[model samples]
Structure formats: C-alpha cells, structure tokens
Target: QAARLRRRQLIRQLLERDKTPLAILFMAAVVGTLVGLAAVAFDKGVAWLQNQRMGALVHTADNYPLLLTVAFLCSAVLAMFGYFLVRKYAPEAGGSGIPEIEGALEDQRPVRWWRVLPVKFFGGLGTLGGGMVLGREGPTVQIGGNIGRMVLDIFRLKGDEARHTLLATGAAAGLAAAFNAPLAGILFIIEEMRPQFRYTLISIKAVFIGVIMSTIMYRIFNHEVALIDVGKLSDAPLNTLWLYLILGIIFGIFGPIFNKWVLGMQDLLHRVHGGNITKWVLMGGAIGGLCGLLGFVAPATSGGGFNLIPIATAGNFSMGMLVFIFVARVITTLLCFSSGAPGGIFAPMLALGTVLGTAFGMVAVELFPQYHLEAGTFAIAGMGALLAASIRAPLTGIILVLEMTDNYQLILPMIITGLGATLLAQFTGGKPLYSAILARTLAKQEAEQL
Candidate 1:
C-alpha cells in the first residue's frame, strides 16, 4: 500500500512538472525572434554569395570559353557539394524538409537537430546559390523546426507539450521570416501543420508570440516588404468572379497530376541513379548548366518563378505565350525538382499558377468583353489556388499572397478561389504535398528494411 501510494505521488509530480503555461509562451517568443534572425541571415547570405559570384563573373562573359566553363563548373561544384553534404551527413535535408518535420512531430520520425541544422543550412546555401529553381521557405521552415528541438534539448525540457509547442513556434517564425508575413506564418501552422499541431489557448498563444517576434526580427533585417511585388490590380467584378472559381477548378486538376508526377519522376530518377553519388552530382550539374544556358537565352522559364509573377500579372504576354511559358516552366520545374537538386517546388508552383491564371483571365476577358475583366486579378487568384490545391492549406495560401503583394482588397476573391480549389482537390482525392512526401519517406524506410 505504501509503495503504490509513493508511485502515485511520483506520477502526480511528473504530471505537474509537465504542465505548460505563460513561461512556455515566453520561450516561444524568444524562439521566434531567433528563427527570424536566422532566416534573414540565411536569405542575405545566399543573395550576397550569388551577387558576389555573378558580379565578378559578368565581366568574364566576353571571355566566352572561360565564362561558359567557369559558370558550369562553379554551379556544378556548388550543387554537388550540397548533394554530397545531404547524402553524407543528413539525407533528410534533401528536397523539401516540411514532410520530415511533420513526421517528426507525429513521433513517426526522428529529429537529429545536431546534424540536420548544419547540413541543411550550409547545404541549402550551396544548392540555392547554384540557381536551382528552388525556394528558401522550405529550408527555413525545416531549420526553424530543428532549432526548436535544439532549444528543447539545450534546456533539458522533456515534456511533450514543451517540445511540441516550441517546435510550432519555430515553424511559424521560420515561415513568417521566409515571406515576411506573420499572419500567414501562423495560418501555415494551423493549416499545413494542423494534423500534427495540437490546439489550445497556451499553444495558440505560443504560436502567436513566435510569429510576432519573428515578424519583428524579419522587419529589422529585411524590412517589411512583400516577397512578390505585383502591385495592386483592379478588383474583379462580381460577375467576373466566376472566372476565378473556374481557374481554381483548373488548378484542382493540375495539382494532383503535378504531385503524382513529382513522385513518379523521383522514383524514376532513384531507379536510374541507384544512389550513385557521382552520377547524381553529374546529373545535377548538367541540369544546373542547362538552366544557366536557358537563363541566357530565355530568362523567363528559368529560376524560382518569383521573378516571373509580376510580369505575368501585368498582362505582358498574350494567352498563347502565357501557355507556352507555363509549359516550359512546368517541364523545367519537374526536371529541377525531380532530379533531387536541393530546392523547393513552391516557387515554381506559384509561377505555374500565374501562367494558368493569366490564361483563364484572358479567356474570360474575351468571352465577357462587357465586364472589362483584368487578367491580373486572375493572376493573383491563380497564384494562391495551386498552393491551396497542392498543399490543401487555403488560409495560408490566401494570406501569403495578400501579404506578399499587399493586395488586401482582393482577399474575398482570393479566399473564394482558394476554397474552390481546396474543395475540388479534396473531391478528387488529392493529398497534401508534404503529407504525400512523408508517406513516401516512410515507405522508403520500410522498403530498405525489407
């Protein structure tokens, strides 16, 4: 009786020790602030490296042999370095890291922060610096989540709530820093990370604190600017809003197809390469070299696609050219992403959405010349729709575009478009991109054992 009573008392003490409150909120704020600084530093670091290299090399273009050889060799070396680091030190850093985090949160995956943090940070720099069609947002989010684990470990915090809450804080901050959008960052947690994220007043407040701090830090470093500056477009007419809905439905179809292709292509590449490091690196170099040549010839279809958003939205291209660019970008996107180059498909997906959306708007304008529809509005609506359909995170997609473009007036149309995309995607039985990635990772693990 005495021993049983002591065990109950010990259990009660442990439960009490695990309770979370305002103190955890304070830790979240600290984490957010730090993550913002880290993300900003990561962004500036890559930009500085790119500019420094290109600035020195631009003058050498006149020396054709040297320029071509150096450009290919430099980019190839950088990308190969990134791939080597991932394969050797932390393979989880390879591709988008969001899925890895999701798996970690569910305890279905392990978080080796000590290895991942350094590997992803420096390895991402090498890959992104090589001018691959990738986004920094994925790396930042992954890094942020790892930072949470690092913090918890450093502080010797052992409870699940503390661990989970801090992880949420880091992810929110990382996202906010990536796009300079605080609300969107919070929404990302609620939407994309929802399955793993537990909601409570304390947890929500922790997330809020993280986002706020991260936003402040991001502003301090990068200034408060939208990632994509498309400028404001005229509002869609009530009669013309249906066009945006139609655009969403189009993306709804494309989103699932794109996801499947992504998985399929990766599988094909895996079979061909068979984990041969030299072959993988050489292929990456070839892809990067081709991208470099493409940049010189048709700059529109190269890079992260963020550069193409404003141009596409400004009605600069005819419908045919828009579709052409869309096709080109789709192929490039698939090539760069599935080749296992260190990059995110997020930016390319946005570009694809812009192309498709612009096409929808052009068609709408021709059909309803009376409504005086502007294609740019559809461009904005399309921008978020693919994200909604692919990621199934409508709120994050909606707010992210709004924050980046400062197009608050079009939020209603944006939400409508996003909702339509999400509904249609779900109806078609499409899964979220990160979720699908995580599923594949688990399957790969099981296959290895077999």
Candidate 2:
C-alpha cells in the first residue's frame, strides 16, 4: 500500500515538472488556428496585390512599348515600400525572417510581434507582389513563430517549456500552413529546429496539437490540395538510381556555393548602402526594377518560382532552356534575396532545383536512352536535393517534397539524393543556410544592439 501510494505521488509530481498545464496545449491550438488564418490571408493578399500590379500592364496591352517601363516603375515602387518598412519600423522583418525566428528560439533575439507581424505580412506583400524572386515560406514561418509568442503573452503563460514549445508549435504550424503539409510541418521543428527544441514529452504533444489545428484550419479555408501539382512519374529504375546520387552531389556542390554567394552578396550590398535608408530603398528600387524587366523578358526568372516548378518538372523546357533559366534564376534569387527584400529563398531554390534536374535528367536520358529513363523523374528528385544539401536536413527536404508533390514512389531516390547532397555539403563546409544566417544576425546584434 505504501509503495503504490508513492508511485502515484511520483506520477503526479512528474506531470507538474513537465511545466505545461492543460492550458499550454490548449493555447497551442489557439496559436495554430490563428497562424493558419494569418497565413491564408497573407498568401491571398500577396496574390491579390500582385494581380493588381500585373493587371495594369494588361489594361494598356496596346501600349506595349510603355508597358515595359510601367512594369519596371510599378515593381520598383512596391519593393521600395517593403524595404522602407523593414528599415523604418521593424528591422527584423527583412530577409527571409527565418533567421530571426531561430535567434528568438535561442533567446538571442526579441519577439517584437507588435511590429513584426504587420511589417512582415505587408512588407512581404510588397516584395513578393512586386515580382521579386522570393518564397512565402520564410515570412509565413516568421509570422507564425511571432504569433506563438504573441499568444503566450496574451495568456501570460510562464515556464521555460511553455514558452519554448509554444513558439516551436507556432513555427511548425506556419510551415504546415505554408505548404499544407502537416507531416513536414511537424518534422521541420523536430529536424530543422532540433538544436533549439527542448524536446520534453509535453513539448512534442504541443507541437502536434498546433500542427493538427493549423492544418485543419488551412484545409477548411483553401480545400485540400498539394502546393505543387506534379503528377506521379515512373519509379526509379535501380540502374539509373546512381544518377540521383550524382544529382545529389551536383546540388551538394552548388548548395554551399549558393550559400556563399548569398552571404557574399549581403556584405557587398551592405557596403554599397552604408546604412543609409534612402540609399537602401533606392537600391531596392533598382533591384526590383531589374526583376520587373526580367519578368517581362522571361516570366520564369522572376517571382517566387512556384509558378515555374510544375512547368519545369513537366519537362517542357529543352536542356538549353533549362540551363538558361537555372543560371538566370540563380542570379536573380541572389540579387533580390541578398538585397534584403522581405522574402524567403526556398521557392527560388526549388525552382532552381527543377531547372537543374530537368537539364541534368535530359543529359541522362540522352546518355542512357536504353534504360528508358525519364528526365521528369530526375527533375522531381532534384526538387528535394538542393534543400537537403543547403538546409542540411535530409528528412525535412524529402518529406516536404514528398508531401507537397505526392511522389511517395520516389522516396528511395529522394533519400539517396538527399543523403548524398547533405553528405557532400558537410564535406564542403556548407553549413545550413538558416543557421548561417542566424549566426550572422547574432554577430551584428551583438555589435549593433539598439
């Protein structure tokens, strides 16, 4: 009787030690649902605003000559507006905003949601809607994580686990909302943010609750659908599987190069702007205007790349065209993102992957036509390879691609490609992009504390 009583007491004490009352789990649902709504609204808002700008050119389609300049002017102004907001109100709102969230997770940064939520959403609309090569995932995740902290403040939730897990919950929900891939959303926290995740029993439960609610909220509003619609291709022939590993190495080699270019561009642009707001805004205008011009010249080179991925993976572009778009998009992605526009880099990266995949796959098909190899298969595999290499999370990359595209049949190739890419990334000293960005932000924060 005494032993049984002591076990019950220990169990009760253990529950309290976990630090989340039912309230924390309950509040996570609140955070998730709210983040879903915010994500949906922001996404719809960006598209609506972009249409308004693009519509202007169509209305004057007859005045084709002037439409070119008009597109440039319009996009330039929009980008300038976004840049101005980031610098003027919330400096943390610029870039992908992913790094900021990481810093916050580590308690090395502040959660100024009062400023970040509004600034990132609207600022993203300005940049993304302006035809910049940027992704929605970063800003949405940033906003979601910010919302988590905001919800905590409202509830006055205390305890280290409550604070950390809730923030983690919101971040996961944001990614889920962004891609509508609940599994990847949950995996993102466990895999990508594992460094900061506290990993208590209650914490994991809270993440799941948040993701489930957020995903539920998203589907109700937008209908269940994969973010990218690439119909399933044939299975990976074991013989040609080596090509995927080769693909992984290809991306693995470029992944670090890509990170270096982005970081390098940051330094170069910083020197040019010299911390002058007006100079920075005008620089933004120039970059935006160039993107506008590029958009008119080649639609695939501008915007966040979501529109291009389906087409690219469908093997529509010739090897030459694929290569051309890959090079052009890479340069454009580096320019727009490194310019400190309020956006994410992943969409552009995905697009680049497809372009490279299609191009490389085309080469493979030519060389091994005897194998009945399909270039589309490699294009799909490439989608996750770059992400795995650069983000250094093979599981998140593979699962995100799998969930978003429903290419479950290609998991083996994906794992091979993803594993190879990340392995090469490690050899090349290519750290995870967000981690690198977070470290850089901390360096500046330490020196430039306001």
Candidate 3:
C-alpha cells in the first residue's frame, strides 16, 4: 500500500519533470562511496579495537585468574562505552537499526544523521570489539541509510523520489560494504525494503550503481566478499531433497519462537530499565562481561557465531555439545539483541541455522545412512532458512547465504528451505521481526509525545 502511494508521485514527476535527473545519480554514487568506506572502516575499526582488548588479554593466558579478570573488565569497559553513548546521545541507534531505516522510508522516524552516523559507527564498533553477540552488517545497514539521508540533505535535495530512492541505495550499499556481496545488497533493497522503498526503473538503476561502487570500494581495500567459507557442497539428490523441506518447516516453527524470544526479552528489559541511562549501561556491561568471560570458558558459545559455521557443518561437535552450544548462543543472542545494544541478529540467525541444520543433518545421516546424506547440505539450507522466515525476505535471504558461503550448487535445497520456512512462519502467526520492532518504536514515540 505504501509502495503504491509512492508510485503516484513518480507518475507526476515522470512526465511533468525529469524525476530521474542525472543529478540524482551523482548523489547515489557519493552514497555508495561513503557507505563502502564506512563499512570498510567498521570492518577494520571493530577488528582494531577487538585486537587491542584480545591482543592484550592474550598475554595473561598463563595466570588463569588474571586472564578471566582482565577479560571481564576489558569487555565491561568497552561495551559500557557504547551503551552510554546510545542512551545519552542517540537511543534510536540501539538494536539492529534496520527498522529505523524502514520507518525513515515511511517518513515517520527521524534520521538525525548528525548524531546517528557517528554514534552507531563508534558504538557498533565498541559492542563488537567488546565481544557482544552482534553483526557488523546490521549496524552497517542503518549507517548506510543514514548516510543516504545525510548526502541528500547536504545537496539540499527536495522531493520524495530523491529521499526514498537514495535511502535504499545507501542502505543497499551498506550491505554490499558489509559482506562484499554486491547483488545481495541490491536484493536487500528490492526485496526487504519493498514496502517502504519507492520502486521505479531508475531508482533500481541507482541501487545498482551504489552497490557497484560499494563493492568496488570493498575490493580495493581487500575487505573481501563471501562472509563464510563453507567450501563447495554437492547437490542434494531427489530422495534427500524432501529432507531440506522438512528442515525448512522446522525453522518455520522455530522462527516464530525466535521472534517471540527477542520481543519478550525486549519487553522485560524495557520494564526493568525504564529508560534509565545508568541502569541501561550497567545492564549492557553485565551482559558484555558475562559473554566476554563465556568466550574464555566456552569460546563457541560467545560473540557473533560466524566462526562456528564451518565447524558445525564439518560435524566436529558431539551431539550434546551441539545442542549445548546452540542453546547457549540462542540465549545470548536474545540477551544481546533485546538489551537495546547496537547489535545485528543477522549473523546470529545464520549461525543458529547452521547449528540446527547440522543437528538435523546428523540425525538424517544416522537414520538414512543408505541415502548417503550429509549434514553439510542441511547446514547450507538452514543457513538462510531462519533469515527468510524471520525477516520475510526469502530472495535476499537465500542469495546472501549463497554468496557468503559460495555454495551456488546448493540453490535448489536453499530455495526449498527458504520457501518452507517463510510459509511456516506465516502460518505459525507472528509479525516479521523488523516490522514488529518498528511498530513498537512508533508506539513508544506516541506515548512519549502524548
């Protein structure tokens, strides 16, 4: 309905004026450049800070007590730095930031680029550096969208065409920058932001331009593409193909539960914190410190679970250990995401998918050893299944996984999984995660204003 509303304005500009003005595209290029640079900067920025902590903490590896103490204190300090910034300066910078851009497209939320751009970047880095279970790509999406607005305002541009089109382009570029997955960046805008992003022939072209420029910047810096290195997987046979569908449907059931977990945790935290900055920052430090120490006792259970994917897929863990790590990551993910920290559920979802899929695949291998089944196949399918189900963006979800893992051969099973998970998620009944967050945000704003 909102996308349709945007089209009416497009028709008036299309014939009456050159709405796809050449000037519009020039700004898009600028959005792409900055988004990629920002993303690259974040990639290196978070790593730089993470090294300073882990780099130093590695020294006390001999003195067990001092190592744990230093790790806890280091993360406590680092995470508190960002939490303080979010509450004091830009509370909207909390969470994945994807929802903020969605509301921005609808013209209901403030961009406040002056504050958000720096707050999110530095804060996002602090959280990741401090070892919170968050995604760099998540913050990058909002940063890019914010960058889009910043550039538009700078040129003193007017009209919805420039506003909506550029936001998506910039956000798309942000994604491209994050993973170096250029096409997925374009798909992110076209598929995920479809409701609020005004679609036009020219608008999409600008998205392509921004992604191209974004990816080009990433490559030049060797920031790299393909977020995961799962190696090549063989295609699934007809008999085992049904298994992927089952796996997908399983995620459908789990997807709603995951969304509920995040929302429920958010509600509880909001009630407890009551928007108090001191309480908020301390809560953040508590979780960060807890997870930071968890990294010491159980490395697999903490931080963004990107590193756990290949290991899960390779069948390295015992069955009980798999479940334990899975359960632990899920709980931490709920805490990290719902605590109003600048974190992305993107990597957590994918990592969970691998763990769950691996669990299923391992069982399948035992039950149907005759079928020559592999857990890796299911692992690849599950990688995107949760994302599609939770975000309701199957196309973007599928491709991003494909690009990240470079498993192009597994497309059939991946498609099957994404479709099944999305359908099941719909049937199970729950709002898409980002949409739900936006509604909650809107509700809070109205209450405050009243």
Residue 279 displacement in candidate 1 (angstroms): 1.8
Model 2 misplaced stretches (Cα beyond 4 Å): 1-20, 196-202
Relative to the unseen true structure, what is the C-alpha lDDT of residue 409 in candidate 2, on a scale of 0 to 100?
88
Instruction: Give the clash count for each candidate.
Output: 0, 0, 0
- What lDDT tens digits, residue by residue, belong to model 1 across residues 1-450? 589799889988788763457668677877887898888888888888677657756678677667767777776777778888888887777778778777777766888899998988898887787777788888898899999888887878667678778887788788888877888888888767845455432277788888888888888877554567766789766776677777778888778888888888889878888889878777777877777556555678876677788788874688777777888888778887777665667778777877888888788878888897787888888889889998787888888888888887778788888988988888988898888888888998999986
lDDT of 3: 0.85
Q: Which stretch of 10 consecutive residues in model 3 shows the poorest summed lDDT?
A: 193-202
In terms of TM-score, which candidate is stronger, 1 or 3?
Answer: 3
Global lDDT scores for all candidate models:
0.79, 0.85, 0.85
RMSD per candidate (Å) reads 4.9, 3.5, 3.6
Over 4 Å off, model 1: 1-20, 63-66, 196-202
Of candidate 2, the 10-residue stretch with the lowest lDDT total is 193-202
